[PDB]
Design a protein around this ligand. Structure first.
Ligand SMILES: *[C@@H]1O[C@H](CO)[C@@H](O[C@@H]2O[C@H](CO)[C@@H](O[C@@H]3O[C@H](CO)[C@@H](O)[C@H](O[C@H]4O[C@H](CO)[C@@H](O)[C@H](O)[C@@H]4O)[C@@H]3O)[C@H](O)[C@H]2NC(C)=O)[C@H](O)[C@H]1NC(C)=O
Ligand SMILES: O=C(C[C@H](Cc1ccc(O)cc1)n1nncc1CNS(=O)(=O)c1ccc(-c2ccccc2)s1)NO
Ligand SMILES: *[C@@H]1O[C@H](CO)[C@@H](O[C@@H]2O[C@H](CO)[C@@H](O)[C@H](O)[C@H]2NC(C)=O)[C@H](O)[C@H]1NC(C)=O
Ligand SMILES: *[C@@H]1O[C@H](CO)[C@@H](O[C@@H]2O[C@H](CO)[C@@H](O)[C@H](O)[C@H]2NC(C)=O)[C@H](O)[C@H]1NC(C)=O
Ligand SMILES: *[C@@H]1O[C@H](CO)[C@@H](O)[C@H](O)[C@H]1NC(C)=O
Ligand SMILES: *[C@@H]1O[C@H](CO)[C@@H](O)[C@H](O)[C@H]1NC(C)=O
Ligand SMILES: *[C@@H]1O[C@H](CO)[C@@H](O)[C@H](O)[C@H]1NC(C)=O
Ligand SMILES: *[C@@H]1O[C@H](CO)[C@@H](O)[C@H](O)[C@H]1NC(C)=O
Ligand SMILES: *[C@@H]1O[C@H](CO)[C@@H](O)[C@H](O)[C@H]1NC(C)=O
Ligand SMILES: *[C@@H]1O[C@H](CO)[C@@H](O)[C@H](O)[C@H]1NC(C)=O
Ligand SMILES: [Br-]
Ligand SMILES: [Br-]
Ligand SMILES: [Br-]
Ligand SMILES: [Br-]
Ligand SMILES: [Br-]
Ligand SMILES: [Br-]
Ligand SMILES: [Br-]
Ligand SMILES: [Br-]
Length: 915
């Protein structure tokens, strides 16, 4: 070659300059041996990778980061020039691409398997990536060290050199070495353990199935487990720090139930013999779906019924399903590349609806799934949005791809799709895909084909439409042309950024339809809006009922404008029944008036997921410049009779969000008025709430929400109960049991005095439930004294009292509250060098810190400081897609304030004037 590029550590040229690995050498079986100490806090290790060469080469490229490689031999069974003992390979490290090059003495012969073998060693990492160190406090006050592995997406290479791209699937055989005082876990169960010369044990795990690197796990710790067996015979075990074993019972119960449901629903036995869920304390990700060894942070798995909320339970249930789901969606079938990551997470997130709704209908989680979409829409409604699958190449660009577009928008379009096809056709399509790609990879296209080409019961009858020798019928031509329709449809939902807005004018019996990209911060008549609607066009599966019928009219819209005729001229039409469709409806003409009519009158004539959607749509149109605020505010008057905790709780959110908004600026005039409307118009529901744990899950949530509202507006009777419960709690030395649904309210009332604040900080360190610890930390952030809040973030940087994994979470709390809002923003700026040392630029921690302290700003002055800060960041190495999204969010807040604030002031003064 031209010797042109590039120079390796040691100064010789590297024979490779692509960021992606070459594909000429393919791995079959990794033979891994890991020997960590945990008093050295380091490890030595060896690996034998059995590899197939296809195009002949004189060098191998594979990933290795921050690993001291010190042997590297090459043996072959078939190319007998490298017969055992084998030959040695020259090793080159190109750290800039996290790659290494092994240099052969003779070109490798195509179509022959070789065995690549290196020895290596590294200190145990100390930063929640790779093979890293992590600790936990016992009930006695003992701190214990565990050594655990988190690899997704590109961190496997930090713990053993390997082909660290998810398409390179392989079998792994993991051997661990450990003192007798520790146990060793990995992906597969444990075949043999041999006692060795110095009383050290060596654990020998069953050989993994074909699997991607980033899923390998191995833990060395001393936890205790709780076990049960599924209908299928899987040995589920909930693993946890030994004094918390009695907090694992729910987890086991639910995962037994869940793991069963999945198996039946997918029609694919979970392959492995065991499955282990382990609750780790120093766990930066919420939970890692490592095949057979799913690691959760304690708050995402454990459950203390004395201190865990009802919503805490639902959260644990959701996460356990989410991880379980990945066993199929992610692990059996895996994305070709990270560009199609939502095939992994966006399915897992849709499934937790399906699965929870099937196993804990008690938890009413179907009534909560619409938040998952409403959340993302606020971000798909910005030019800053990305398509579901977008190219990504850097480690950072990958990390970046786990935002809410992959999780949430992926989840919602699936639920949209499913409601297009009905769940029995939609499940048969999910099976035909997990089966077809078992132990392989799929890309975006692969899925849409396999869902598009559904089969209702593979009827395989005398002439089943699917399978064997079918019959050539009128339906079959509908089938195949209706199938191509749904693949050609969902292809636009995954390749176009953003979210459509359907305009609906009613013209007597004729209904006219327009489609356009819904956008915020920008009106229609703005000079920048004609330029963002240009080529966006979806295939939007519409639905609608009307005032005169509940039948579900279904029509596909594949064009920029369309009109539908209608019979029995109705009072009003409701589009997008139940808000299952990933789109917003704006009724032109008297449309928005006529629906508000129905809600203000009988109101049951609209079905509750309509009201939830209508409540939602009405307000975003206000933020689209389409509706004067007073229309959305007038919908909330109906909430007085809203029987449905969901729609009540939503309409309530907006009315509360305004308050926090107004409070962050000294807009006390609207601030007080918003309080007075909240406590006086919703007084009948606030006052009948109980200070207890009783009621259904939605009943409980509506208690905590309202009791928090009341104490955040300082309603003396509701502050007084919390003061008194708090004092009783503190005078019992923690022994009195506060109801869980009141547990956070009581602490942050108690945090409001420095005696209370101090006792809570002391109690944080002594608590045996992460669940409680978390509520106490919210209480501490509730403080109005800056020196206290600053101590909190000071303790967060030390990682001892408050672990750093909650420091992003902590900052965000502090910055939400007005007293600490500048303090957060100022802190992040003054220590941005120090935050980068603790956290990867692509981490969820850093992204949350950024938007956590800035995205609530609603002033042109703070926008400048934010633009200025992000500029400085771009000038250095740092570049994140979040920077734009934050600025477009602040800009949307400035514009929404400019157009709407005086409407909110007159609306509220008008209400006072009527009553
Ligand atoms: C992690 O590292 C720790 C220390 O860093 C290590 O523990 C040490 O193990 C060694 C043996 O490997 C222990 O030393 C032995 O103690 C026993 C006590 O029963 C004696 O019988 C031994 O005497 C013989 O061995 C010596 C060398 O091992 C010879 O010099 C001697 O002449 C005898 O032949 C010997 O003293 C040592 O006590 C521990 N230390 C601690 C603090 O535990 C541990 O094994 C490592 N673990 C893993 C998993 O790698
Ligand atoms: O899904 C996953 C990883 C993600 C975590 C992740 C990490 C980095 C990143 O850049 C994006 C997401 N996760 N962890 N628990 C559930 C989920 C998915 N539900 S989530 O709503 O999207 C969600 C994201 C973060 C959550 C959390 C968890 C505990 C405490 C507070 C917040 S909860 N593994 O399988
Ligand atoms: C690597 O894992 C694969 C699973 O993907 C193993 O393949 C199975 O092997 C058994 C035993 O030979 C067969 O009966 C199964 O039908 C295979 N299943 C599939 C899906 O291929 C394979 O044995 C593993 N390889 C090694 C070397 O352990
Ligand atoms: C949640 O589970 C419920 C059952 O608990 C599902 O409701 C059933 O839906 C089928 C098909 O729509 C009906 O034939 C049954 O009569 C329903 N059972 C009821 C209403 O008790 C519901 O479809 C599930 N939701 C989701 C989103 O999967
Ligand atoms: C080797 O690489 C070339 C690149 O053009 C490809 O066409 C070929 O199919 C590969 N495999 C062989 C030659 O076996
Ligand atoms: C490689 O490992 C073997 C034992 O595994 C050792 O004999 C040898 O000295 C090591 N290094 C070199 C450079 O040969
Ligand atoms: C088990 O959990 C209960 C209730 O959450 C708790 O009160 C108890 O202290 C735990 N067991 C022990 C031995 O501490
Ligand atoms: C919207 O994003 C696209 C992405 O290429 C860009 O070209 C365009 O200028 C952006 N528009 C605005 C108003 O930021
Ligand atoms: C709404 O109409 C239904 C159907 O006739 C009726 O049962 C219900 O009492 C009505 N509610 C009100 C408030 O008029
Ligand atoms: C609002 O006014 C109070 C008056 O006591 C003042 O102390 C406070 O700093 C002001 N807050 C802001 C954000 O201007
Ligand atoms: Br089954
Ligand atoms: Br992650
Ligand atoms: Br997290
Ligand atoms: Br945790
Ligand atoms: Br939840
Ligand atoms: Br009260
Ligand atoms: Br601001
Ligand atoms: Br301003």
């Amino acid at each position: 070659d031209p010797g042109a590029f590039p120079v390796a550590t040691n100064g010789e040229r590297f024979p490779w300059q692509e960021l992606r690995l070459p594909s000429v050498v393919i791995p079959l079986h990794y033979d891994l041996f890991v020997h960590p100490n945990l008093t050295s806090l380091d490890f030595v290790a060896s690996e034998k990778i059995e590899v197939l060469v296809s195009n002949a080469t004189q060098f191998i490229i594979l990933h290795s980061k921050d690993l001291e490689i010190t042997n590297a031999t090459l043996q072959s069974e078939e190319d007998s020039r490298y017969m055992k003992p084998g030959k040695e390979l020259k090793v080159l490290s190109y750290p800039a691409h996290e790659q290494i090059a092994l240099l052969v003495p003779e070109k490798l012969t195509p179509h022959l398997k070789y065995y690549v073998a290196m020895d290596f060693q590294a200190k145990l990492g100390d930063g929640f990536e790779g093979f890293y160190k992590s600790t936990y406090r016992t009930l006695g006050g003992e701190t214990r060290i565990l050594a655990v592995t988190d690899f997704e997406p590109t961190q496997a290479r930090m713990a053993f050199p390997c082909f660290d791209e998810p398409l390179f699937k392989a079998n792994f055989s993991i051997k661990i070495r450990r003192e007798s005082r520790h146990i060793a876990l990995s992906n597969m169960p444990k075949v043999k353990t041999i006692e060795l010369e110095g009383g050290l044990l060596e654990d020998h795990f069953e050989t993994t199935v074909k699997m991607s690197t980033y899923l390998v796990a191995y833990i060395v710790c001393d936890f205790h487990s709780l076990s049960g067996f599924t209908s299928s015979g899987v040995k589920v075990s909930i693993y946890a720090s030994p004094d918390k074993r009695n907090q694992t019972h729910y987890a086991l119960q639910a995962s037994l139930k869940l793991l069963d449901f999945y198996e039946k629903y997918f029609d694919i036995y979970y392959p492995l013999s065991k499955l282990d869920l382990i609750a780790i304390p120093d766990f930066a990700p919420g939970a890692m779906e490592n095949w057979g060894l799913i690691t959760y942070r304690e708050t995402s798995l454990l459950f203390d019924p004395k201190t865990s909320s009802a919503s805490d339970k639902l959260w644990v249930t959701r996460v356990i399903a989410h991880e379980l789901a990945h066993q199929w969606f992610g692990n059996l079938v895996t994305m070709e590349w990270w560009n199609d990551i939502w095939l992994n997470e966006g399915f897992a997130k849709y499934m937790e609806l399906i699965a929870v709704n099937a196993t804990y209908p008690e938890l009413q989680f179907d009534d909560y799934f619409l938040n998952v979409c409403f959340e993302v829409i606020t971000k798909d409604s910005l030019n800053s949005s990305r398509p579901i699958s977008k190219p990504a190449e850097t480690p950072t660009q990958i990390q970046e791809m786990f935002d809410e577009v992959s999780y949430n928008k992926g989840a919602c379009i699936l639920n949209m799709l499913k409601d297009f096809l009905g769940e029995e056709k939609f499940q048969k399509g999910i099976i035909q895909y997990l089966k077809k790609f078992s132990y392989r990879n799929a890309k975006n296209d692969d899925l849409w084909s396999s869902l598009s080409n559904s089969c209702l019961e593979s009827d395989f009858t005398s002439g089943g439409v699917c399978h064997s020798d079918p019959k050539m019928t009128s339906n079959m031509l509908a089938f195949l042309g209706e199938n191509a329709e749904v693949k050609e449809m969902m292809t636009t939902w995954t390749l176009q950024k953003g979210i459509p807005l359907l305009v609906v004018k009613q013209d007597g019996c004729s209904l006219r339809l327009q489609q356009e990209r819904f956008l915020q911060g920008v009106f229609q008549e703005d000079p920048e809006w004609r330029a963002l609607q240009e080529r966006y066009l979806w295939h939007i599966p519409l639905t609608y009922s009307t005032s005169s019928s509940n039948v579900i009219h279904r029509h596909i819209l594949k064009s920029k404008t369309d009109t539908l005729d209608l019979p029995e001229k109705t009072s009003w039409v409701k589009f997008n029944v139940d808000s299952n469709g990933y789109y917003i409806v704006h009724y032109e003409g008297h449309g928005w008036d006529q629906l508000i009519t129905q809600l203000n009158q009988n109101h049951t004539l609209l079905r509750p997921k309509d009201r939830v959607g209508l409540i939602h749509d009405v307000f975003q149109l206000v933020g689209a410049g389409r509706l004067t605020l007073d229309k959305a505010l007038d919908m909330t008057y109906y909430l007085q009779h809203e029987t449905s905790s969901p729609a009540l709780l939503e309409g309530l959110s907006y009315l509360e969000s305004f308050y926090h908004m107004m409070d962050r600026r000294n807009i006390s005039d609207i601030s007080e008025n918003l309080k007075r409307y909240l406590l006086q118009y919703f007084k009948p529901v606030i006052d009948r709430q109980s200070w207890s744990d009783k009621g259904s899950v939605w009943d409980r949530m509506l208690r905590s929400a309202l009791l928090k509202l009341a104490c955040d507006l300082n309603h003396a009777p509701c502050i007084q109960k919390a003061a008194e419960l708090f004092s009783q709690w503190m005078e019992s030395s923690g022994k009195l049991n506060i109801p869980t649904d009141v547990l956070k309210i009581v602490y942050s009332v108690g945090a409001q005095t420095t005696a209370g604040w101090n006792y809570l900080l002391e109690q944080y360190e002594l608590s045996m439930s992460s669940a409680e610890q978390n509520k106490i930390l919210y209480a501490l952030s509730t403080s109005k004294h800056q020196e206290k809040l600053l101590k909190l973030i000071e303790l967060g940087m030390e990682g001892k009292v408050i672990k750093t994994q909650n420091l992003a979470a902590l900052l965000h709390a502090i910055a939400r509250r007005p007293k600490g809002q500048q303090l957060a923003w100022d802190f992040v700026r003054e220590n941005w060098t120090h935050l980068l040392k603790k956290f990867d630029l692509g981490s969820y921690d850093i992204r949350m810190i950024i938007s956590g302290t800035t995205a609530h700003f609603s002033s042109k002055d703070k926008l400048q400081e934010v633009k200025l800060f992000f500029e400085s960041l771009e000038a250095q190495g740092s570049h994140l897609d979040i920077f734009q999204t934050v600025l477009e969010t602040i800009t949307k807040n400035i514009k929404w304030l400019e157009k709407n604030l005086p409407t909110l002031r007159t609306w509220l003064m008008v209400n006072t004037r009527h009553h």
